[PDB]
Design a protein around this ligand. Structure first.
Ligand code: HEM
Length: 402
Protein backbone atom coordinates (compact mmCIF):
# COMPACT_ATOMS: atom_id res chain seq x y z
CA UNK A 1 0.00 0.00 0.00
CA UNK A 2 2.12 2.89 1.37
CA UNK A 3 5.92 3.07 1.06
CA UNK A 4 7.76 2.82 4.36
CA UNK A 5 11.12 4.50 3.75
CA UNK A 6 14.19 2.53 4.72
CA UNK A 7 15.94 3.83 7.87
CA UNK A 8 18.97 6.10 7.43
CA UNK A 9 22.36 4.40 7.55
CA UNK A 10 23.75 5.11 11.04
CA UNK A 11 27.53 5.30 11.42
CA UNK A 12 28.77 3.31 14.44
CA UNK A 13 32.41 4.33 15.12
CA UNK A 14 34.67 2.36 17.46
CA UNK A 15 34.48 3.99 20.88
CA UNK A 16 36.08 2.88 24.13
CA UNK A 17 33.35 2.87 26.77
CA UNK A 18 34.15 3.25 30.52
CA UNK A 19 33.52 0.21 32.75
CA UNK A 20 30.11 -1.34 32.08
CA UNK A 21 28.41 1.81 30.71
CA UNK A 22 25.89 1.08 27.96
CA UNK A 23 26.78 2.22 24.39
CA UNK A 24 24.85 5.44 23.74
CA UNK A 25 24.91 4.83 19.97
CA UNK A 26 23.25 1.45 20.62
CA UNK A 27 20.69 3.22 22.82
CA UNK A 28 20.01 5.65 19.96
CA UNK A 29 19.53 2.71 17.58
CA UNK A 30 17.21 0.98 20.05
CA UNK A 31 15.08 4.12 20.20
CA UNK A 32 14.94 4.55 16.43
CA UNK A 33 12.82 1.48 15.71
CA UNK A 34 13.09 -2.29 15.65
CA UNK A 35 14.91 -2.37 12.31
CA UNK A 36 17.80 0.00 11.60
CA UNK A 37 20.76 0.19 9.22
CA UNK A 38 24.35 0.56 10.44
CA UNK A 39 27.79 1.15 9.10
CA UNK A 40 30.71 -0.11 11.16
CA UNK A 41 34.36 1.05 10.91
CA UNK A 42 35.52 -1.89 8.74
CA UNK A 43 34.27 -3.94 5.80
CA UNK A 44 32.05 -2.17 3.27
CA UNK A 45 28.52 -0.82 2.92
CA UNK A 46 25.75 -1.19 5.46
CA UNK A 47 23.87 -3.91 7.31
CA UNK A 48 20.46 -4.26 8.89
CA UNK A 49 20.39 -4.31 12.71
CA UNK A 50 17.64 -5.76 14.91
CA UNK A 51 17.44 -4.91 18.63
CA UNK A 52 14.13 -6.34 19.96
CA UNK A 53 14.13 -9.76 21.66
CA UNK A 54 11.62 -11.34 19.27
CA UNK A 55 13.41 -10.12 16.13
CA UNK A 56 16.77 -11.25 17.50
CA UNK A 57 15.36 -14.75 18.12
CA UNK A 58 13.90 -14.76 14.60
CA UNK A 59 17.10 -13.74 12.87
CA UNK A 60 19.35 -16.09 14.83
CA UNK A 61 17.11 -19.18 14.70
CA UNK A 62 15.39 -19.00 11.29
CA UNK A 63 16.80 -21.15 8.44
CA UNK A 64 16.24 -18.27 6.03
CA UNK A 65 19.41 -16.61 7.43
CA UNK A 66 22.83 -18.06 6.75
CA UNK A 67 26.37 -17.80 8.09
CA UNK A 68 28.48 -19.28 5.28
CA UNK A 69 27.25 -16.62 2.87
CA UNK A 70 28.85 -13.97 5.13
CA UNK A 71 32.24 -14.83 3.70
CA UNK A 72 31.09 -14.08 0.13
CA UNK A 73 31.79 -10.35 0.59
CA UNK A 74 33.18 -7.65 2.88
CA UNK A 75 30.23 -7.09 5.20
CA UNK A 76 30.50 -3.94 7.35
CA UNK A 77 32.09 -5.02 10.64
CA UNK A 78 33.84 -3.78 13.80
CA UNK A 79 36.99 -5.97 13.69
CA UNK A 80 39.82 -4.77 11.40
CA UNK A 81 40.58 -8.34 10.24
CA UNK A 82 38.18 -11.02 9.01
CA UNK A 83 37.64 -14.69 8.08
CA UNK A 84 40.62 -16.73 9.45
CA UNK A 85 39.69 -20.24 8.41
CA UNK A 86 36.46 -21.01 6.53
CA UNK A 87 35.79 -24.18 8.48
CA UNK A 88 35.43 -22.13 11.63
CA UNK A 89 32.30 -23.21 13.45
CA UNK A 90 30.99 -19.63 13.38
CA UNK A 91 30.86 -19.66 9.58
CA UNK A 92 29.21 -23.05 9.08
CA UNK A 93 25.55 -23.70 8.33
CA UNK A 94 23.60 -26.94 9.10
CA UNK A 95 25.07 -28.95 6.31
CA UNK A 96 28.22 -29.10 8.50
CA UNK A 97 27.65 -26.86 11.55
CA UNK A 98 25.43 -29.48 13.13
CA UNK A 99 28.00 -32.28 12.72
CA UNK A 100 30.63 -30.20 14.48
CA UNK A 101 28.45 -28.95 17.36
CA UNK A 102 26.90 -32.40 17.86
CA UNK A 103 30.34 -34.00 18.18
CA UNK A 104 30.98 -32.16 21.53
CA UNK A 105 27.50 -31.10 22.66
CA UNK A 106 27.32 -33.70 25.47
CA UNK A 107 30.31 -32.23 27.34
CA UNK A 108 28.75 -28.75 27.42
CA UNK A 109 25.23 -29.46 28.71
CA UNK A 110 24.40 -28.70 32.37
CA UNK A 111 25.02 -32.36 33.16
CA UNK A 112 28.11 -32.43 30.99
CA UNK A 113 29.80 -29.50 32.68
CA UNK A 114 28.81 -30.75 36.14
CA UNK A 115 31.43 -33.47 35.57
CA UNK A 116 34.23 -30.99 36.26
CA UNK A 117 32.62 -28.97 39.07
CA UNK A 118 34.39 -30.52 42.05
CA UNK A 119 37.83 -30.51 40.40
CA UNK A 120 37.24 -26.93 39.29
CA UNK A 121 36.20 -25.88 42.77
CA UNK A 122 39.45 -27.40 44.01
CA UNK A 123 41.59 -25.61 41.43
CA UNK A 124 39.88 -22.34 42.31
CA UNK A 125 40.64 -22.94 45.99
CA UNK A 126 44.28 -23.40 45.05
CA UNK A 127 44.35 -20.08 43.23
CA UNK A 128 42.62 -18.25 46.07
CA UNK A 129 44.90 -19.98 48.65
CA UNK A 130 47.85 -18.56 46.79
CA UNK A 131 46.36 -15.06 46.55
CA UNK A 132 45.58 -14.99 50.28
CA UNK A 133 49.06 -16.27 51.12
CA UNK A 134 50.75 -13.56 49.04
CA UNK A 135 48.63 -10.94 50.85
CA UNK A 136 46.84 -7.77 49.62
CA UNK A 137 46.53 -6.01 47.32
CA UNK A 138 46.12 -8.19 44.24
CA UNK A 139 44.96 -7.95 40.66
CA UNK A 140 42.00 -10.32 40.83
CA UNK A 141 42.14 -10.78 37.06
CA UNK A 142 45.79 -11.88 37.04
CA UNK A 143 45.51 -13.89 40.24
CA UNK A 144 42.20 -15.65 39.65
CA UNK A 145 39.84 -14.63 36.85
CA UNK A 146 42.43 -15.22 34.09
CA UNK A 147 43.97 -18.55 35.15
CA UNK A 148 40.77 -20.23 36.40
CA UNK A 149 38.86 -20.53 33.11
CA UNK A 150 41.99 -21.98 31.46
CA UNK A 151 42.38 -24.59 34.23
CA UNK A 152 38.73 -25.54 33.93
CA UNK A 153 38.80 -25.90 30.17
CA UNK A 154 41.97 -28.00 30.39
CA UNK A 155 40.07 -30.40 32.62
CA UNK A 156 36.94 -30.46 30.43
CA UNK A 157 39.03 -30.93 27.26
CA UNK A 158 40.95 -33.80 28.79
CA UNK A 159 44.43 -32.31 28.32
CA UNK A 160 47.12 -34.57 29.89
CA UNK A 161 48.35 -32.96 33.15
CA UNK A 162 51.98 -32.52 32.01
CA UNK A 163 50.84 -30.47 29.03
CA UNK A 164 48.46 -28.13 30.78
CA UNK A 165 50.99 -25.50 31.62
CA UNK A 166 52.04 -25.50 27.94
CA UNK A 167 48.32 -24.99 27.26
CA UNK A 168 48.23 -22.02 29.63
CA UNK A 169 51.17 -20.40 27.96
CA UNK A 170 49.83 -21.00 24.46
CA UNK A 171 46.46 -19.56 25.41
CA UNK A 172 48.07 -16.46 26.89
CA UNK A 173 50.21 -15.97 23.80
CA UNK A 174 47.36 -16.42 21.33
CA UNK A 175 45.91 -13.05 20.22
CA UNK A 176 46.21 -11.72 23.85
CA UNK A 177 49.78 -10.84 24.70
CA UNK A 178 52.00 -8.52 22.73
CA UNK A 179 54.48 -9.30 19.88
CA UNK A 180 51.78 -8.85 17.30
CA UNK A 181 51.49 -11.19 14.31
CA UNK A 182 54.47 -13.51 15.08
CA UNK A 183 54.21 -15.11 18.56
CA UNK A 184 50.41 -15.29 18.49
CA UNK A 185 50.24 -17.34 15.25
CA UNK A 186 53.23 -19.46 16.29
CA UNK A 187 51.40 -20.26 19.57
CA UNK A 188 48.34 -20.97 17.46
CA UNK A 189 50.38 -23.31 15.29
CA UNK A 190 51.75 -25.16 18.30
CA UNK A 191 48.29 -25.51 19.84
CA UNK A 192 46.92 -26.65 16.47
CA UNK A 193 49.61 -29.30 16.17
CA UNK A 194 49.06 -30.40 19.76
CA UNK A 195 45.32 -30.90 19.38
CA UNK A 196 45.84 -32.55 15.98
CA UNK A 197 47.99 -35.13 17.69
CA UNK A 198 45.84 -35.64 20.81
CA UNK A 199 42.58 -35.88 18.86
CA UNK A 200 44.28 -38.14 16.31
CA UNK A 201 45.50 -40.38 19.13
CA UNK A 202 41.96 -40.53 20.48
CA UNK A 203 40.47 -41.75 17.18
CA UNK A 204 38.82 -44.71 18.90
CA UNK A 205 38.40 -43.37 22.42
CA UNK A 206 35.21 -43.87 24.42
CA UNK A 207 36.29 -41.08 26.74
CA UNK A 208 33.86 -38.28 27.51
CA UNK A 209 36.27 -35.36 27.75
CA UNK A 210 36.03 -33.05 24.74
CA UNK A 211 39.16 -34.16 22.88
CA UNK A 212 38.08 -37.82 23.25
CA UNK A 213 34.67 -36.95 21.83
CA UNK A 214 36.35 -35.09 18.99
CA UNK A 215 38.75 -37.99 18.38
CA UNK A 216 35.92 -40.51 18.26
CA UNK A 217 33.82 -38.34 15.92
CA UNK A 218 36.85 -38.03 13.64
CA UNK A 219 37.32 -41.79 13.84
CA UNK A 220 33.74 -42.38 12.71
CA UNK A 221 34.14 -39.83 9.87
CA UNK A 222 31.49 -37.53 11.34
CA UNK A 223 33.95 -34.65 11.13
CA UNK A 224 37.41 -34.15 9.66
CA UNK A 225 40.56 -33.84 11.74
CA UNK A 226 40.89 -30.21 10.60
CA UNK A 227 37.36 -29.32 11.73
CA UNK A 228 37.96 -31.01 15.08
CA UNK A 229 41.26 -29.19 15.66
CA UNK A 230 39.80 -25.80 14.77
CA UNK A 231 36.91 -26.25 17.16
CA UNK A 232 39.20 -27.58 19.89
CA UNK A 233 41.36 -24.46 19.65
CA UNK A 234 38.28 -22.17 19.79
CA UNK A 235 36.93 -23.94 22.87
CA UNK A 236 40.37 -23.99 24.51
CA UNK A 237 40.86 -20.22 24.17
CA UNK A 238 37.19 -19.38 24.79
CA UNK A 239 37.55 -18.89 28.56
CA UNK A 240 38.78 -15.34 28.09
CA UNK A 241 35.11 -14.53 27.66
CA UNK A 242 34.55 -15.68 31.26
CA UNK A 243 37.64 -13.79 32.41
CA UNK A 244 36.26 -10.56 30.93
CA UNK A 245 32.63 -11.13 31.86
CA UNK A 246 33.35 -12.23 35.43
CA UNK A 247 35.63 -9.20 35.66
CA UNK A 248 32.61 -7.03 34.95
CA UNK A 249 30.65 -9.13 37.47
CA UNK A 250 33.08 -8.41 40.29
CA UNK A 251 33.56 -4.80 39.23
CA UNK A 252 29.78 -4.47 39.73
CA UNK A 253 29.67 -6.49 42.95
CA UNK A 254 32.44 -4.34 44.45
CA UNK A 255 31.43 -0.92 43.12
CA UNK A 256 27.78 -1.51 44.10
CA UNK A 257 28.22 -3.02 47.57
CA UNK A 258 24.49 -3.77 47.99
CA UNK A 259 24.81 -6.49 45.32
CA UNK A 260 27.69 -8.21 47.08
CA UNK A 261 25.83 -7.80 50.38
CA UNK A 262 22.79 -9.54 48.91
CA UNK A 263 24.87 -12.45 47.70
CA UNK A 264 26.49 -12.86 51.12
CA UNK A 265 23.18 -12.59 52.98
CA UNK A 266 21.27 -14.98 50.69
CA UNK A 267 23.74 -17.44 49.08
CA UNK A 268 20.78 -19.38 47.71
CA UNK A 269 20.11 -16.60 45.17
CA UNK A 270 23.58 -16.77 43.66
CA UNK A 271 22.68 -18.84 40.57
CA UNK A 272 19.77 -16.51 39.68
CA UNK A 273 21.92 -13.50 40.50
CA UNK A 274 24.58 -14.73 38.13
CA UNK A 275 21.98 -15.08 35.40
CA UNK A 276 20.83 -11.55 36.01
CA UNK A 277 24.38 -10.31 35.88
CA UNK A 278 24.87 -12.23 32.64
CA UNK A 279 21.76 -10.58 31.25
CA UNK A 280 22.81 -7.07 32.19
CA UNK A 281 26.58 -6.97 31.58
CA UNK A 282 27.46 -5.38 28.22
CA UNK A 283 29.64 -8.29 27.15
CA UNK A 284 30.90 -6.95 23.80
CA UNK A 285 31.56 -3.77 21.80
CA UNK A 286 28.98 -3.08 19.08
CA UNK A 287 27.92 -6.31 17.30
CA UNK A 288 29.76 -9.44 16.26
CA UNK A 289 29.00 -11.65 13.30
CA UNK A 290 26.11 -11.06 10.88
CA UNK A 291 23.95 -13.48 8.90
CA UNK A 292 22.89 -13.18 5.24
CA UNK A 293 19.20 -13.29 4.27
CA UNK A 294 19.01 -16.32 1.97
CA UNK A 295 15.61 -15.23 0.65
CA UNK A 296 13.48 -12.09 1.18
CA UNK A 297 12.28 -11.81 4.79
CA UNK A 298 9.89 -9.23 6.24
CA UNK A 299 10.69 -7.96 9.71
CA UNK A 300 8.35 -5.42 11.37
CA UNK A 301 7.13 -4.30 7.95
CA UNK A 302 10.65 -3.89 6.56
CA UNK A 303 11.69 -5.98 3.57
CA UNK A 304 15.07 -7.53 4.15
CA UNK A 305 16.33 -8.49 0.70
CA UNK A 306 18.06 -11.75 -0.12
CA UNK A 307 21.77 -11.03 0.03
CA UNK A 308 21.48 -8.29 2.68
CA UNK A 309 23.53 -8.64 5.85
CA UNK A 310 21.68 -8.65 9.16
CA UNK A 311 23.15 -8.14 12.64
CA UNK A 312 21.53 -8.88 15.97
CA UNK A 313 22.35 -7.06 19.19
CA UNK A 314 22.09 -9.54 22.03
CA UNK A 315 23.00 -6.67 24.39
CA UNK A 316 20.02 -4.65 23.19
CA UNK A 317 17.74 -7.71 23.27
CA UNK A 318 18.71 -8.20 26.89
CA UNK A 319 17.30 -4.71 27.65
CA UNK A 320 14.02 -5.29 25.78
CA UNK A 321 11.50 -3.50 28.05
CA UNK A 322 8.65 -5.84 27.16
CA UNK A 323 10.57 -9.00 28.02
CA UNK A 324 12.58 -7.45 30.87
CA UNK A 325 10.53 -4.83 32.72
CA UNK A 326 12.78 -2.10 34.14
CA UNK A 327 15.56 -3.61 31.95
CA UNK A 328 18.36 -1.39 33.24
CA UNK A 329 17.77 -2.50 36.80
CA UNK A 330 19.92 -5.31 38.16
CA UNK A 331 17.28 -7.38 39.97
CA UNK A 332 18.59 -10.70 41.32
CA UNK A 333 15.02 -11.91 41.89
CA UNK A 334 14.02 -11.25 38.27
CA UNK A 335 10.95 -13.50 37.56
CA UNK A 336 11.48 -15.10 34.29
CA UNK A 337 14.96 -14.34 32.88
CA UNK A 338 15.10 -15.46 29.19
CA UNK A 339 18.29 -13.55 28.37
CA UNK A 340 20.31 -14.17 25.20
CA UNK A 341 23.75 -13.32 26.54
CA UNK A 342 24.83 -16.72 25.23
CA UNK A 343 23.17 -16.07 21.92
CA UNK A 344 20.33 -17.94 20.28
CA UNK A 345 19.64 -20.43 17.52
CA UNK A 346 22.09 -23.04 16.17
CA UNK A 347 25.13 -20.84 16.87
CA UNK A 348 24.27 -20.30 20.57
CA UNK A 349 27.31 -20.40 22.80
CA UNK A 350 28.50 -23.96 23.58
CA UNK A 351 30.23 -22.56 26.66
CA UNK A 352 27.15 -21.03 28.33
CA UNK A 353 26.60 -23.76 30.91
CA UNK A 354 30.32 -23.90 31.52
CA UNK A 355 30.42 -20.10 31.98
CA UNK A 356 27.61 -20.27 34.53
CA UNK A 357 29.43 -23.01 36.45
CA UNK A 358 32.68 -21.03 36.43
CA UNK A 359 30.88 -17.85 37.49
CA UNK A 360 29.06 -19.64 40.34
CA UNK A 361 32.30 -21.12 41.71
CA UNK A 362 34.09 -17.77 41.33
CA UNK A 363 31.38 -15.84 43.16
CA UNK A 364 31.42 -18.44 45.95
CA UNK A 365 35.18 -18.32 46.55
CA UNK A 366 35.65 -14.57 46.06
CA UNK A 367 32.66 -13.55 48.21
CA UNK A 368 33.17 -16.18 50.91
CA UNK A 369 36.95 -16.45 51.27
CA UNK A 370 38.32 -12.89 51.01
CA UNK A 371 37.78 -11.07 54.33
CA UNK A 372 36.88 -7.40 53.83
CA UNK A 373 37.25 -7.59 50.06
CA UNK A 374 36.91 -4.23 48.29
CA UNK A 375 38.30 -2.39 45.30
CA UNK A 376 41.78 -0.93 45.86
CA UNK A 377 41.00 1.97 43.49
CA UNK A 378 37.95 4.12 42.81
CA UNK A 379 35.52 2.23 40.53
CA UNK A 380 36.11 4.65 37.67
CA UNK A 381 39.87 4.05 38.00
CA UNK A 382 39.64 0.36 37.11
CA UNK A 383 41.20 0.10 33.65
CA UNK A 384 38.94 -1.49 31.02
CA UNK A 385 40.01 -2.96 27.65
CA UNK A 386 40.49 -0.47 24.84
CA UNK A 387 40.07 -1.28 21.14
CA UNK A 388 38.38 -4.50 22.21
CA UNK A 389 35.78 -6.85 20.78
CA UNK A 390 34.87 -8.25 24.20
CA UNK A 391 34.62 -5.70 27.00
CA UNK A 392 36.02 -6.12 30.48
CA UNK A 393 38.74 -5.06 32.85
CA UNK A 394 42.44 -5.05 31.94
CA UNK A 395 43.00 -5.49 35.68
CA UNK A 396 40.80 -5.58 38.76
CA UNK A 397 42.82 -4.30 41.73
CA UNK A 398 41.38 -5.42 45.06
CA UNK A 399 42.38 -5.33 48.69
CA UNK A 400 41.27 -6.99 51.91
CA UNK A 401 42.24 -7.79 55.51
CA UNK A 402 45.39 -9.86 55.84
C1 HEM B 1 29.93 -15.48 30.04
C2 HEM B 1 30.96 -15.96 29.00
C3 HEM B 1 30.49 -16.08 27.52
C4 HEM B 1 29.61 -15.32 26.80
C5 HEM B 1 28.79 -14.08 27.24
C6 HEM B 1 29.58 -15.89 25.45
C7 HEM B 1 28.83 -15.40 24.43
C8 HEM B 1 28.77 -15.86 23.15
C9 HEM B 1 27.98 -15.30 22.06
C10 HEM B 1 27.07 -14.07 22.20
C11 HEM B 1 28.21 -16.04 20.96
C12 HEM B 1 27.64 -15.84 19.53
C13 HEM B 1 26.35 -16.54 19.17
C14 HEM B 1 26.00 -16.28 17.70
O1 HEM B 1 26.87 -16.44 16.85
O2 HEM B 1 24.81 -15.89 17.47
C15 HEM B 1 29.15 -17.09 21.34
C16 HEM B 1 29.65 -18.06 20.51
C17 HEM B 1 30.56 -19.06 20.84
N1 HEM B 1 31.11 -19.22 22.11
FE1 HEM B 1 30.75 -18.13 23.73
N2 HEM B 1 30.43 -16.99 25.38
C18 HEM B 1 30.99 -17.12 26.63
C19 HEM B 1 31.90 -18.12 26.95
C20 HEM B 1 32.39 -19.10 26.09
C21 HEM B 1 33.35 -20.13 26.49
C22 HEM B 1 33.95 -20.26 27.92
C23 HEM B 1 33.59 -20.88 25.40
C24 HEM B 1 34.52 -22.11 25.24
C25 HEM B 1 34.02 -23.39 25.92
C26 HEM B 1 32.78 -20.34 24.32
C27 HEM B 1 32.71 -20.81 23.03
C28 HEM B 1 31.96 -20.31 21.99
C29 HEM B 1 31.93 -20.83 20.64
C30 HEM B 1 32.75 -22.04 20.15
C31 HEM B 1 31.05 -20.07 19.93
C32 HEM B 1 30.66 -20.23 18.45
C33 HEM B 1 29.41 -21.17 18.37
C34 HEM B 1 28.87 -21.43 16.98
O3 HEM B 1 28.90 -20.47 16.18
O4 HEM B 1 28.43 -22.56 16.71
N3 HEM B 1 32.05 -19.25 24.77
N4 HEM B 1 29.47 -16.95 22.67
Amino acid sequence: TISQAVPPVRDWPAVDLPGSDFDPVLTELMREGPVTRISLPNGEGWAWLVTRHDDVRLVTNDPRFGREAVMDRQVTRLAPHFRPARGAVGFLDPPDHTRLRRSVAAAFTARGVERVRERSRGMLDELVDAMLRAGPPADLTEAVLSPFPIAVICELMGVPATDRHSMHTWTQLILSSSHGAEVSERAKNEMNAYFSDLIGLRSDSAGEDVTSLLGAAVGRDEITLSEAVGLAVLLQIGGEAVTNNSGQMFHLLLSRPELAERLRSEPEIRPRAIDELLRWIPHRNAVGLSRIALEDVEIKGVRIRAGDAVYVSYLAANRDPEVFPDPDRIDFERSPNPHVSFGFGPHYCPGGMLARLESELLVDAVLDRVPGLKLAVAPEDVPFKKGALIRGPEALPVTWHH
